[PDB]
Amino acid sequence: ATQGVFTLPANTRFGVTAFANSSGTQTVNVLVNNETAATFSGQSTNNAVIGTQVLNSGSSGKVQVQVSVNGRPSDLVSAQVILTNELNFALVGSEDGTDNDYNDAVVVINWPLG
Amino acid sequence: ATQGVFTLPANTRFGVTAFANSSGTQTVNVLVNNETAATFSGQSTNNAVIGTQVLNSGSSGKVQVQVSVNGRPSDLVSAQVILTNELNFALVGSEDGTDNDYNDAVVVINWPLG
Amino acid sequence: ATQGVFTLPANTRFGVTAFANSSGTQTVNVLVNNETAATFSGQSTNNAVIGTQVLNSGSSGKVQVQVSVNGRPSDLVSAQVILTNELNFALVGSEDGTDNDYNDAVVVINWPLG
Amino acid sequence: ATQGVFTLPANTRFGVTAFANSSGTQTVNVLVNNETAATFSGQSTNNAVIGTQVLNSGSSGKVQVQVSVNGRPSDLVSAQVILTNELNFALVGSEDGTDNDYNDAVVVINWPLG
Numbered sequence: 001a002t003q004g005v006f007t008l009p010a011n012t013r014f015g016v017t018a019f020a021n022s023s024g025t026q027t028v029n030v031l032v033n034n035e036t037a038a039t040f041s042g043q044s045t046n047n048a049v050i051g052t053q054v055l056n057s058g059s060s061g062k063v064q065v066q067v068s069v070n071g072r073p074s075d076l077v078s079a080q081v082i083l084t085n086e087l088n089f090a091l092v093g094s095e096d097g098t099d100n101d102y103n104d105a106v107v108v109i110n111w112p113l114g
Numbered sequence: 115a116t117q118g119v120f121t122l123p124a125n126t127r128f129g130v131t132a133f134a135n136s137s138g139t140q141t142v143n144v145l146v147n148n149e150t151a152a153t154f155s156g157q158s159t160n161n162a163v164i165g166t167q168v169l170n171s172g173s174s175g176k177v178q179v180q181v182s183v184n185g186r187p188s189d190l191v192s193a194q195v196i197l198t199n200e201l202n203f204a205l206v207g208s209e210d211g212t213d214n215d216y217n218d219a220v221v222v223i224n225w226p227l228g
Numbered sequence: 229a230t231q232g233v234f235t236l237p238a239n240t241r242f243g244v245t246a247f248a249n250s251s252g253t254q255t256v257n258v259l260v261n262n263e264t265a266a267t268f269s270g271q272s273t274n275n276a277v278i279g280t281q282v283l284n285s286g287s288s289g290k291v292q293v294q295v296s297v298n299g300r301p302s303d304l305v306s307a308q309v310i311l312t313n314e315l316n317f318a319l320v321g322s323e324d325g326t327d328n329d330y331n332d333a334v335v336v337i338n339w340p341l342g
Numbered sequence: 343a344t345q346g347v348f349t350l351p352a353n354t355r356f357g358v359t360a361f362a363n364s365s366g367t368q369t370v371n372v373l374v375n376n377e378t379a380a381t382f383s384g385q386s387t388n389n390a391v392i393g394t395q396v397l398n399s400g401s402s403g404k405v406q407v408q409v410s411v412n413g414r415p416s417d418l419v420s421a422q423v424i425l426t427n428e429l430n431f432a433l434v435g436s437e438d439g440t441d442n443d444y445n446d447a448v449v450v451i452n453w454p455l456g
């Protein structure tokens with residue numbers, strides 16, 4: 001199944017934050033309405049924040065997370081969770097190798113903000 | 115029900131990251147085995163990362179998040195999500211006021227690391 | 229925080245299914261736009277299905293689950309989870325006593341159907 | 343990523359329940375330590391509960407859900423969620439066709455019981 005694709009409410013600010021846990025430099029692309037809206041890159045084996053941004057979900061609310069290591073797409077896993085019918089998390093993990101820890105880049109999207 | 119309390123695997127490194135979305139200064143305390151292990155403070159209405167740390171779950175694996183705003187405890191909501199049977203997120207939202215957006219401090223715990 | 233309250237898409241059919249794990253007879257009320265739309269009641273310590281039904285979320289999409297044991301309201305825990313941006317679960321646990329297993333009535337709401 | 347595989351606590355009773363939403367007859371297999379422990383089957387476009395059973399997770403705690411429609415394996419999506427650090431749901435959706443509703447067989451595993 002498709003992973004790393006979320007429908008947010010239209011025209012809504014959201015946070016995106018990426019962490020790294022891999023020997024490889026992670027490249028995280030965040031697409032809004034099928035166009036690149038933010039790109040992060042960094043390397044850490046200690047959960048370093050390689051990127052954090054506030055974006056607008058745009059008129060469609062379509063947000064996609066892609067992860068690559070030296071141009072090779074990582075295998076993604078994802079889910080959305082809503083707490084108390086208000087607080088939204090869109091969560092992505094990614095696997096760049098064979099150990100299947102799925103933490104090589106970790107991306108958290110959260111809304112609403114403010 | 116109790117919220118903001120999670121049992122991790124023993125002796126396991128985890129990341130904890132806090133975000134703020136409120137007029138009020140958030141204080142986020144992260145306890146391991148009932149002992150303060152990290153404290154973050156800050157004020158943002160735009161999802162600032164008021165802090166991020168790597169901690170060890172220790173012999174009990176017990177991790178608790180507490181949030182307060184000038185010494186008043188915020189109301190918490192929480193859940194844990196596991197992707198592909200391997201990648202763990204422990205999620206907390208908090209409310210300092212009356213609007214019930216539960217984003218006033220947002221805390222994300224993730225493991226495993228590395 | 230409020231629990232057992234979910235906003236579904238308007239005018240959308242959903243499944244609601246309850247299970248029991250308690251010495252107490254569980255009463256599960258499902259409200260749609262603040263009106264009782266289904267009531268299940270039953271007793272099991274072995275996860276028996278005490279009721280299943282398909283409802284329509286109506287113009288508001290507001291669905292609420294309440295659980296009581298002989299008119300005593302149970303404490304609830306809840307969350308919504310979305311897989312591959314398509315499949316929705318609204319999950320409720322409930323506690324009627326002192327052991328805090330929160331399984332005394334378990335309610336699963338799922339959509340879309342068909 | 344692998345989907346429909348969950349590590350439960352060893353030697354623990356759990357509920358497994360399947361729902362159908364498809365023109366195709368669903369077959370759900372539930373494996374415990376890599377051996378078939380339960381098989382459910384039915385055909386519904388209205389969320390019929392085609393099976394529900396209580397199983398034991400056995401010494402490994404490994405539970406796997408597989409879905410097929412006239413011998414063709416369906417594509418799976420899954421996650422586990424934990425509420426109040428106690429109540430566990432392991433969730434599976436499946437796709438037998440081209441519309442990607444992922445509801446064609448829906449499986450819910452819940453523990454603890456009793």
Ligand SMILES: CC(=O)N[C@@H]1[C@@H](O[C@@H]2O[C@@H](C)[C@@H](O)[C@@H](O)[C@@H]2O)[C@H](O[C@@H]2O[C@H](CO)[C@H](O)[C@H](O)[C@H]2O)[C@@H](CO)O[C@H]1O
Pocket residue numbers: 021022023024025045069095096097098099100101102104228
């Ligand atoms: C792109 C990349 O560097 N992947 C492979 C490495 O595995 C990554 O980095 C390590 C440190 C872990 O974070 C992995 O989960 C991640 O996919 C790999 O590094 C080795 O991984 C071992 C477990 O897979 C173990 O941690 C070992 O200590 C570490 O060196 C290197 C070397 O095998 O190969 C890359 O292709």
Ligand SMILES: CC(=O)N[C@@H]1[C@@H](O[C@@H]2O[C@@H](C)[C@@H](O)[C@@H](O)[C@@H]2O)[C@H](O[C@@H]2O[C@H](CO)[C@H](O)[C@H](O)[C@H]2O)[C@@H](CO)O[C@H]1O
Pocket residue numbers: 114135136137138139159183209210211212213214215216218
């Ligand atoms: C600790 C504190 O200041 N809390 C209340 C204020 O609300 C907080 O800050 C605002 C900016 C939002 O992030 C709220 O979610 C958060 O709880 C509250 O401030 C007012 O909140 C309104 C919504 O309730 C709206 O954002 C408004 O613009 C903002 O000024 C003040 C006034 O009600 O009360 C505090 O309790």
Ligand SMILES: CC(=O)N[C@@H]1[C@@H](O[C@@H]2O[C@@H](C)[C@@H](O)[C@@H](O)[C@@H]2O)[C@H](O[C@@H]2O[C@H](CO)[C@H](O)[C@H](O)[C@H]2O)[C@@H](CO)O[C@H]1O
Pocket residue numbers: 249250251252253273297323324325326327328329332456
């Ligand atoms: C409605 C009710 O009777 N609630 C409490 C009882 O506990 C319920 O039923 C038992 C079988 C468990 O499913 C509990 O999770 C559930 O809340 C409680 O019954 C006792 O619960 C013990 C564990 O707390 C244990 O299972 C024991 O066998 C059982 O008798 C009674 C008496 O403690 O109190 C009610 O409040």
Ligand SMILES: CC(=O)N[C@@H]1[C@@H](O[C@@H]2O[C@@H](C)[C@@H](O)[C@@H](O)[C@@H]2O)[C@H](O[C@@H]2O[C@H](CO)[C@H](O)[C@H](O)[C@H]2O)[C@@H](CO)O[C@H]1O
Pocket residue numbers: 342363364365366387411437438439440441442443444446
């Ligand atoms: C196993 C099978 O028959 N799969 C496809 C059919 O779609 C399944 O059944 C329908 C009723 C829905 O529950 C689907 O989600 C499910 O995968 C499919 O039947 C047609 O599906 C349409 C949407 O793709 C629509 O629901 C229509 O009413 C129904 O006839 C058939 C024919 O397109 O193709 C199979 O692959």
Ligand SMILES: [Ca+2]
Pocket residue numbers: 095096097098099100101102103104
């Ligand atoms: Ca890896």
Ligand SMILES: [Ca+2]
Pocket residue numbers: 021022101102103104227228
């Ligand atoms: Ca890694």
Ligand SMILES: [Ca+2]
Pocket residue numbers: 136209210211212213214215216217218
């Ligand atoms: Ca607030």
Ligand SMILES: [Ca+2]
Pocket residue numbers: 113114135136215216217218
């Ligand atoms: Ca706020």
Ligand SMILES: [Ca+2]
Pocket residue numbers: 250323324325326327328329330331332
């Ligand atoms: Ca109980």
Ligand SMILES: [Ca+2]
Pocket residue numbers: 249250329330331332455456
């Ligand atoms: Ca019980």
Ligand SMILES: [Ca+2]
Pocket residue numbers: 364437438439440441442443444445446
């Ligand atoms: Ca389908």
Ligand SMILES: [Ca+2]
Pocket residue numbers: 341342363364443444445446
């Ligand atoms: Ca279907």
